Amino acid sequence: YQPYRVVVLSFELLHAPATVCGPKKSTNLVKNKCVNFNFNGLTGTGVLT
Amino acid sequence: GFNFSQILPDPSKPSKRSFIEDLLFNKVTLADAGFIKQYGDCLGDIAAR
Ligand SMILES: *[C@@H]1O[C@H](CO)[C@@H](O[C@@H]2O[C@H](CO)[C@@H](O)[C@H](O)[C@H]2NC(C)=O)[C@H](O)[C@H]1NC(C)=O
């Protein structure tokens, strides 16, 4: 019976272009060789063109 | 008096195929191809769909 203070967060994931992001520093853009990548949380491995 | 020319091979082609055999080759179309060395292809191209 003491009052509690509540916050409720709510968000979508990997749908559209994004605005809120995380504290991560970017790199350059290498092409035509097999690298990992990270585009707004989307991971992967392959060759960019 | 029998004339086996349409089923015996002719030397003008670069293969030993007769006149009925390449009529038979150009009627079995493929739902998917086999090997065209499409491994240099499918990498880095836009017509990979
Ligand atoms: C066997 O049949 C073939 C096809 O009918 C004959 O080939 C023809 O030969 C004449 C030559 O007089 C050419 O004008 C035609 O164009 C040929 N036809 C084709 C489809 O190529 C062949 O001559 C016949 N064999 C014999 C011994 O008569």
Short mmCIF file of N, CA, C and O and ligand atoms in Angstrom, two decimals:
data_model
loop_
_atom_site.label_atom_id
_atom_site.label_comp_id
_atom_site.label_asym_id
_atom_site.label_seq_id
_atom_site.Cartn_x
_atom_site.Cartn_y
_atom_site.Cartn_z
N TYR A 1 0.80 -1.21 0.00
CA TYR A 1 0.00 0.00 0.00
C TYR A 1 0.84 1.27 0.00
O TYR A 1 0.28 2.36 0.06
N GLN A 2 2.16 1.15 -0.04
CA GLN A 2 2.87 2.36 -0.46
C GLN A 2 2.81 2.47 -1.98
O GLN A 2 2.81 1.45 -2.67
N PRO A 3 2.77 3.67 -2.56
CA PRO A 3 2.66 3.76 -4.02
C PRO A 3 3.96 3.42 -4.72
O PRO A 3 5.05 3.75 -4.24
N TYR A 4 3.84 2.76 -5.86
CA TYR A 4 4.98 2.45 -6.72
C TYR A 4 4.89 3.27 -8.00
O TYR A 4 3.79 3.53 -8.50
N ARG A 5 6.04 3.67 -8.53
CA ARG A 5 6.11 4.46 -9.74
C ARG A 5 6.57 3.59 -10.90
O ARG A 5 7.60 2.92 -10.80
N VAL A 6 5.80 3.59 -11.99
CA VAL A 6 5.95 2.63 -13.08
C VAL A 6 6.24 3.38 -14.37
O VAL A 6 5.57 4.36 -14.69
N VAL A 7 7.25 2.91 -15.11
CA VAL A 7 7.50 3.33 -16.49
C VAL A 7 7.34 2.10 -17.38
O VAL A 7 7.79 1.01 -17.01
N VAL A 8 6.70 2.27 -18.53
CA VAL A 8 6.50 1.20 -19.49
C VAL A 8 7.09 1.66 -20.82
O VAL A 8 6.63 2.65 -21.40
N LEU A 9 8.11 0.95 -21.29
CA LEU A 9 8.70 1.22 -22.59
C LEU A 9 8.12 0.27 -23.62
O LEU A 9 7.64 -0.82 -23.30
N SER A 10 8.16 0.70 -24.88
CA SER A 10 7.54 -0.06 -25.97
C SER A 10 8.14 0.38 -27.29
O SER A 10 8.18 1.58 -27.57
N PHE A 11 8.58 -0.58 -28.09
CA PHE A 11 9.25 -0.25 -29.34
C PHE A 11 9.13 -1.41 -30.32
O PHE A 11 8.97 -2.56 -29.92
N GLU A 12 9.20 -1.08 -31.61
CA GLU A 12 9.30 -2.06 -32.67
C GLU A 12 10.76 -2.41 -32.91
O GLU A 12 11.67 -1.76 -32.41
N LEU A 13 10.99 -3.46 -33.70
CA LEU A 13 12.35 -3.94 -33.94
C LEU A 13 12.51 -4.38 -35.38
O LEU A 13 11.83 -5.32 -35.82
N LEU A 14 13.41 -3.71 -36.10
CA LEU A 14 13.84 -4.04 -37.47
C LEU A 14 12.67 -4.04 -38.45
O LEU A 14 12.35 -5.04 -39.09
N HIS A 15 12.02 -2.88 -38.55
CA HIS A 15 10.90 -2.68 -39.46
C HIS A 15 11.19 -1.61 -40.50
O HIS A 15 11.06 -1.87 -41.70
N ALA A 16 11.59 -0.43 -40.07
CA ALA A 16 11.61 0.78 -40.86
C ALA A 16 12.94 1.48 -40.62
O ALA A 16 13.77 0.93 -39.87
N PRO A 17 13.24 2.61 -41.26
CA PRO A 17 14.34 3.45 -40.78
C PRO A 17 14.17 3.85 -39.33
O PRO A 17 13.05 4.03 -38.83
N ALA A 18 15.29 4.01 -38.65
CA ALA A 18 15.33 4.11 -37.20
C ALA A 18 15.81 5.48 -36.77
O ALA A 18 16.57 6.14 -37.48
N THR A 19 15.37 5.90 -35.59
CA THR A 19 15.79 7.17 -35.01
C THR A 19 16.55 6.97 -33.70
O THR A 19 17.68 7.44 -33.58
N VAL A 20 15.96 6.29 -32.73
CA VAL A 20 16.67 5.99 -31.50
C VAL A 20 17.64 4.85 -31.77
O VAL A 20 17.28 3.86 -32.42
N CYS A 21 18.87 4.99 -31.30
CA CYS A 21 19.92 4.03 -31.62
C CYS A 21 20.76 3.79 -30.38
O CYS A 21 20.37 4.15 -29.26
N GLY A 22 21.91 3.16 -30.57
CA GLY A 22 22.77 2.81 -29.46
C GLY A 22 24.12 3.49 -29.52
O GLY A 22 24.51 4.06 -30.55
N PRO A 23 24.85 3.46 -28.42
CA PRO A 23 26.17 4.10 -28.38
C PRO A 23 27.26 3.28 -29.06
O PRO A 23 28.03 2.54 -28.45
N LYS A 24 27.34 3.41 -30.38
CA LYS A 24 28.31 2.66 -31.16
C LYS A 24 28.91 3.56 -32.24
O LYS A 24 28.19 4.31 -32.90
N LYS A 25 30.22 3.47 -32.40
CA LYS A 25 30.93 4.28 -33.38
C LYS A 25 31.00 3.54 -34.71
O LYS A 25 31.25 2.33 -34.75
N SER A 26 30.80 4.28 -35.80
CA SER A 26 30.76 3.70 -37.13
C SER A 26 32.16 3.38 -37.63
O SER A 26 33.16 3.52 -36.92
N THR A 27 32.24 2.91 -38.87
CA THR A 27 33.49 2.60 -39.55
C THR A 27 33.31 3.11 -40.98
O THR A 27 32.37 3.86 -41.26
N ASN A 28 34.19 2.73 -41.90
CA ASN A 28 34.05 3.10 -43.30
C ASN A 28 33.22 2.04 -44.02
O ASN A 28 32.61 1.16 -43.40
N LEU A 29 33.18 2.10 -45.35
CA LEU A 29 32.41 1.17 -46.16
C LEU A 29 33.34 0.49 -47.16
O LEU A 29 33.73 1.09 -48.16
N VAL A 30 33.70 -0.75 -46.88
CA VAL A 30 34.55 -1.55 -47.75
C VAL A 30 33.65 -2.39 -48.65
O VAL A 30 32.55 -2.81 -48.24
N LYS A 31 34.05 -2.57 -49.90
CA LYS A 31 33.26 -3.31 -50.87
C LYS A 31 34.11 -4.41 -51.51
O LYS A 31 35.34 -4.40 -51.42
N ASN A 32 33.40 -5.36 -52.11
CA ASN A 32 33.96 -6.42 -52.96
C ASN A 32 34.90 -7.36 -52.20
O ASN A 32 35.81 -7.94 -52.80
N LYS A 33 34.69 -7.53 -50.90
CA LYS A 33 35.38 -8.56 -50.14
C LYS A 33 34.52 -8.97 -48.96
O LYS A 33 33.77 -8.16 -48.41
N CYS A 34 34.64 -10.24 -48.57
CA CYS A 34 33.76 -10.85 -47.57
C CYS A 34 34.07 -10.27 -46.19
O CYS A 34 35.14 -10.51 -45.63
N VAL A 35 33.13 -9.49 -45.65
CA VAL A 35 33.26 -8.87 -44.34
C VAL A 35 31.99 -9.14 -43.54
O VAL A 35 30.96 -9.53 -44.09
N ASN A 36 32.08 -8.93 -42.23
CA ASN A 36 30.88 -8.80 -41.42
C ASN A 36 30.35 -7.38 -41.54
O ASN A 36 31.06 -6.47 -41.96
N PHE A 37 29.10 -7.19 -41.16
CA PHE A 37 28.57 -5.84 -41.10
C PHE A 37 27.55 -5.73 -39.97
O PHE A 37 27.21 -6.71 -39.31
N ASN A 38 27.07 -4.50 -39.77
CA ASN A 38 26.09 -4.21 -38.73
C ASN A 38 25.35 -2.94 -39.17
O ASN A 38 25.87 -1.84 -39.01
N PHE A 39 24.15 -3.11 -39.72
CA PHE A 39 23.33 -2.00 -40.18
C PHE A 39 22.13 -1.89 -39.25
O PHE A 39 21.13 -2.59 -39.45
N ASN A 40 22.23 -1.02 -38.24
CA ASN A 40 21.16 -0.71 -37.28
C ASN A 40 20.71 -1.95 -36.52
O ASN A 40 19.53 -2.13 -36.24
N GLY A 41 21.66 -2.81 -36.16
CA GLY A 41 21.38 -4.03 -35.44
C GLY A 41 21.31 -5.26 -36.31
O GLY A 41 21.51 -6.37 -35.81
N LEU A 42 21.02 -5.10 -37.60
CA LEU A 42 21.04 -6.21 -38.54
C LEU A 42 22.48 -6.67 -38.77
O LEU A 42 23.28 -5.95 -39.37
N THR A 43 22.80 -7.87 -38.30
CA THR A 43 24.14 -8.42 -38.49
C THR A 43 24.18 -9.18 -39.82
O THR A 43 23.24 -9.15 -40.61
N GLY A 44 25.28 -9.87 -40.07
CA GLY A 44 25.43 -10.61 -41.31
C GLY A 44 26.89 -10.79 -41.66
O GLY A 44 27.78 -10.39 -40.93
N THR A 45 27.10 -11.41 -42.81
CA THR A 45 28.43 -11.71 -43.34
C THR A 45 28.30 -11.89 -44.84
O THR A 45 27.43 -12.66 -45.28
N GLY A 46 29.12 -11.20 -45.62
CA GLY A 46 29.05 -11.37 -47.06
C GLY A 46 29.81 -10.28 -47.78
O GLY A 46 30.69 -9.63 -47.21
N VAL A 47 29.46 -10.10 -49.05
CA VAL A 47 30.16 -9.21 -49.97
C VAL A 47 29.21 -8.10 -50.38
O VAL A 47 28.10 -8.37 -50.86
N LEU A 48 29.63 -6.85 -50.21
CA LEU A 48 28.84 -5.71 -50.61
C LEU A 48 29.18 -5.29 -52.03
O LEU A 48 30.30 -5.48 -52.50
N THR A 49 28.18 -4.77 -52.73
CA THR A 49 28.33 -4.25 -54.09
C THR A 49 27.36 -3.08 -54.23
O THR A 49 26.88 -2.54 -53.22
N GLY B 1 18.55 -48.74 -101.74
CA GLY B 1 17.50 -47.77 -101.91
C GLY B 1 16.98 -47.18 -100.62
O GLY B 1 16.17 -46.25 -100.67
N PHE B 2 17.42 -47.69 -99.47
CA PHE B 2 17.03 -47.13 -98.19
C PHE B 2 17.93 -45.96 -97.86
O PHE B 2 19.13 -45.98 -98.12
N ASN B 3 17.34 -44.92 -97.27
CA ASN B 3 18.02 -43.64 -97.07
C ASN B 3 18.02 -43.31 -95.59
O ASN B 3 17.03 -42.81 -95.05
N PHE B 4 19.15 -43.57 -94.92
CA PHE B 4 19.30 -43.35 -93.49
C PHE B 4 19.98 -42.03 -93.17
O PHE B 4 20.72 -41.94 -92.19
N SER B 5 19.77 -41.00 -93.99
CA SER B 5 20.55 -39.78 -93.83
C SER B 5 20.10 -38.94 -92.65
O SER B 5 20.93 -38.29 -92.01
N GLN B 6 18.81 -38.95 -92.34
CA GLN B 6 18.29 -38.12 -91.26
C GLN B 6 18.59 -38.68 -89.88
O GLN B 6 18.44 -37.96 -88.90
N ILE B 7 19.01 -39.94 -89.77
CA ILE B 7 19.34 -40.53 -88.48
C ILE B 7 20.80 -40.88 -88.34
O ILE B 7 21.23 -41.25 -87.24
N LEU B 8 21.54 -40.78 -89.35
CA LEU B 8 22.98 -40.93 -89.20
C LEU B 8 23.60 -39.56 -88.94
O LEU B 8 23.03 -38.54 -89.31
N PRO B 9 24.75 -39.48 -88.28
CA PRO B 9 25.35 -38.17 -88.01
C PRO B 9 25.91 -37.51 -89.25
O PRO B 9 26.24 -38.16 -90.25
N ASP B 10 25.99 -36.18 -89.19
CA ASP B 10 26.61 -35.36 -90.22
C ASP B 10 27.85 -34.67 -89.66
O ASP B 10 27.83 -34.21 -88.51
N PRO B 11 28.93 -34.60 -90.44
CA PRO B 11 30.19 -34.07 -89.90
C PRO B 11 30.23 -32.55 -89.76
O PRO B 11 31.14 -32.04 -89.09
N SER B 12 29.28 -31.83 -90.36
CA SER B 12 29.33 -30.37 -90.39
C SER B 12 29.16 -29.75 -89.01
O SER B 12 29.73 -28.69 -88.73
N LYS B 13 28.37 -30.39 -88.15
CA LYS B 13 28.21 -29.92 -86.79
C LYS B 13 29.49 -30.18 -85.99
O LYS B 13 30.31 -31.02 -86.37
N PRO B 14 29.70 -29.45 -84.89
CA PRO B 14 30.78 -29.80 -83.96
C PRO B 14 30.47 -30.95 -83.02
O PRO B 14 31.22 -31.17 -82.07
N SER B 15 29.38 -31.69 -83.25
CA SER B 15 29.06 -32.88 -82.49
C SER B 15 28.64 -33.97 -83.47
O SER B 15 28.45 -33.73 -84.66
N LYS B 16 28.48 -35.18 -82.94
CA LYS B 16 28.06 -36.33 -83.73
C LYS B 16 26.54 -36.51 -83.72
O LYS B 16 26.05 -37.64 -83.80
N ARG B 17 25.79 -35.43 -83.60
CA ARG B 17 24.35 -35.52 -83.50
C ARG B 17 23.74 -35.54 -84.89
O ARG B 17 24.23 -34.89 -85.81
N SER B 18 22.66 -36.30 -85.04
CA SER B 18 21.97 -36.42 -86.31
C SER B 18 20.94 -35.31 -86.43
O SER B 18 20.91 -34.37 -85.63
N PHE B 19 20.06 -35.41 -87.42
CA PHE B 19 19.05 -34.38 -87.60
C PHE B 19 17.86 -34.58 -86.67
O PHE B 19 17.17 -33.61 -86.35
N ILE B 20 17.59 -35.81 -86.24
CA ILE B 20 16.50 -36.02 -85.30
C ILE B 20 16.96 -35.71 -83.88
O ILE B 20 16.16 -35.26 -83.05
N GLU B 21 18.25 -35.88 -83.59
CA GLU B 21 18.71 -35.74 -82.21
C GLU B 21 18.73 -34.29 -81.76
O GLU B 21 18.38 -33.99 -80.62
N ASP B 22 19.09 -33.37 -82.64
CA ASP B 22 19.03 -31.97 -82.23
C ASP B 22 17.64 -31.37 -82.39
O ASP B 22 17.39 -30.29 -81.85
N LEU B 23 16.75 -32.03 -83.13
CA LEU B 23 15.33 -31.71 -83.00
C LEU B 23 14.82 -32.12 -81.63
O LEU B 23 13.96 -31.44 -81.06
N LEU B 24 15.32 -33.23 -81.10
CA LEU B 24 14.92 -33.66 -79.77
C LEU B 24 15.56 -32.82 -78.68
O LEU B 24 15.01 -32.73 -77.58
N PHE B 25 16.72 -32.23 -78.93
CA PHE B 25 17.35 -31.42 -77.90
C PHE B 25 16.66 -30.07 -77.73
O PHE B 25 16.62 -29.54 -76.62
N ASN B 26 16.12 -29.51 -78.81
CA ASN B 26 15.50 -28.20 -78.76
C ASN B 26 14.01 -28.27 -78.48
O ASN B 26 13.26 -27.38 -78.89
N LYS B 27 13.55 -29.32 -77.80
CA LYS B 27 12.18 -29.41 -77.35
C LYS B 27 12.05 -29.71 -75.87
O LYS B 27 10.96 -29.54 -75.32
N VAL B 28 13.11 -30.14 -75.21
CA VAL B 28 13.10 -30.35 -73.77
C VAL B 28 13.68 -29.08 -73.16
O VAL B 28 14.89 -28.96 -72.96
N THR B 29 12.81 -28.13 -72.87
CA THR B 29 13.22 -26.93 -72.16
C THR B 29 13.32 -27.23 -70.67
O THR B 29 12.69 -28.16 -70.15
N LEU B 30 14.12 -26.43 -69.98
CA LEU B 30 14.49 -26.69 -68.60
C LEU B 30 13.78 -25.71 -67.68
O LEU B 30 13.76 -24.50 -67.95
N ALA B 31 13.20 -26.23 -66.59
CA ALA B 31 12.64 -25.37 -65.56
C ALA B 31 13.74 -24.68 -64.77
O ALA B 31 13.55 -23.56 -64.28
N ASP B 32 14.89 -25.33 -64.62
CA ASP B 32 16.10 -24.71 -64.12
C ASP B 32 17.27 -25.29 -64.89
O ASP B 32 17.25 -26.45 -65.30
N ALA B 33 18.30 -24.47 -65.09
CA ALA B 33 19.50 -24.93 -65.77
C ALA B 33 20.33 -25.82 -64.85
O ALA B 33 20.04 -26.00 -63.66
N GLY B 34 21.40 -26.36 -65.41
CA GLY B 34 22.32 -27.19 -64.66
C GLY B 34 23.55 -26.40 -64.28
O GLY B 34 23.54 -25.66 -63.29
N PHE B 35 24.62 -26.57 -65.05
CA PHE B 35 25.89 -25.90 -64.80
C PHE B 35 26.27 -25.10 -66.04
O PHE B 35 26.44 -25.67 -67.12
N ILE B 36 26.35 -23.79 -65.88
CA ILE B 36 26.85 -22.89 -66.91
C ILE B 36 28.12 -22.18 -66.41
O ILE B 36 28.57 -21.19 -66.99
N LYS B 37 28.74 -22.77 -65.38
CA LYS B 37 29.70 -22.12 -64.49
C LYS B 37 29.14 -20.79 -64.01
O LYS B 37 29.67 -19.70 -64.28
N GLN B 38 28.03 -20.90 -63.28
CA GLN B 38 27.35 -19.77 -62.68
C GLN B 38 27.87 -19.48 -61.27
O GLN B 38 27.14 -18.95 -60.42
N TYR B 39 29.12 -19.83 -61.00
CA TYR B 39 29.72 -19.50 -59.72
C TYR B 39 30.58 -18.25 -59.78
O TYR B 39 30.73 -17.56 -58.77
N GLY B 40 31.16 -17.94 -60.94
CA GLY B 40 31.63 -16.58 -61.17
C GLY B 40 30.47 -15.61 -61.19
O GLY B 40 30.57 -14.49 -60.68
N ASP B 41 29.34 -16.04 -61.75
CA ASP B 41 28.07 -15.35 -61.61
C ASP B 41 27.52 -15.62 -60.20
O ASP B 41 28.09 -16.37 -59.41
N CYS B 42 26.41 -14.94 -59.87
CA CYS B 42 25.68 -14.88 -58.60
C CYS B 42 26.46 -14.14 -57.51
O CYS B 42 25.92 -13.92 -56.43
N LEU B 43 27.70 -13.73 -57.77
CA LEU B 43 28.51 -12.95 -56.84
C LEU B 43 28.66 -11.54 -57.40
O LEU B 43 29.22 -11.36 -58.49
N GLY B 44 28.16 -10.55 -56.67
CA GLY B 44 28.38 -9.16 -57.00
C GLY B 44 27.52 -8.61 -58.12
O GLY B 44 27.59 -7.40 -58.39
N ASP B 45 26.73 -9.44 -58.79
CA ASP B 45 25.90 -8.96 -59.88
C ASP B 45 24.51 -8.61 -59.39
O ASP B 45 24.10 -8.97 -58.28
N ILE B 46 23.78 -7.89 -60.23
CA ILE B 46 22.41 -7.49 -59.94
C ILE B 46 21.40 -8.46 -60.54
O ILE B 46 20.32 -8.67 -59.96
N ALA B 47 21.75 -9.12 -61.65
CA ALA B 47 20.92 -10.18 -62.21
C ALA B 47 21.25 -11.52 -61.55
O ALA B 47 21.71 -12.47 -62.19
N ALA B 48 21.01 -11.58 -60.24
CA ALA B 48 21.17 -12.79 -59.45
C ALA B 48 19.85 -13.25 -58.85
O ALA B 48 19.84 -14.00 -57.87
N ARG B 49 18.73 -12.80 -59.42
CA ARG B 49 17.40 -13.09 -58.90
C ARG B 49 16.68 -14.14 -59.75
O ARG B 49 15.47 -14.06 -59.97
C1 LIG C 1 18.10 -38.93 -98.44
O1 LIG C 1 17.16 -37.92 -98.04
C2 LIG C 1 17.72 -36.61 -97.91
C3 LIG C 1 16.59 -35.72 -97.44
O2 LIG C 1 15.46 -35.83 -98.30
C4 LIG C 1 18.32 -36.15 -99.24
O3 LIG C 1 18.99 -34.91 -99.02
C5 LIG C 1 18.63 -33.96 -100.04
O4 LIG C 1 19.58 -34.00 -101.12
C6 LIG C 1 19.27 -33.09 -102.20
C7 LIG C 1 20.32 -33.32 -103.26
O5 LIG C 1 19.73 -33.61 -104.52
C8 LIG C 1 19.25 -31.65 -101.68
O6 LIG C 1 18.85 -30.79 -102.74
C9 LIG C 1 18.28 -31.53 -100.51
O7 LIG C 1 18.36 -30.22 -99.96
C10 LIG C 1 18.60 -32.56 -99.43
N1 LIG C 1 17.63 -32.47 -98.35
C11 LIG C 1 17.98 -32.17 -97.10
C12 LIG C 1 16.86 -32.12 -96.10
O8 LIG C 1 19.14 -31.94 -96.78
C13 LIG C 1 19.32 -37.19 -99.75
O9 LIG C 1 19.78 -36.85 -101.05
C14 LIG C 1 18.69 -38.58 -99.80
N2 LIG C 1 19.67 -39.56 -100.22
C15 LIG C 1 19.76 -40.00 -101.48
C16 LIG C 1 20.83 -41.01 -101.75
O10 LIG C 1 19.01 -39.60 -102.36
#
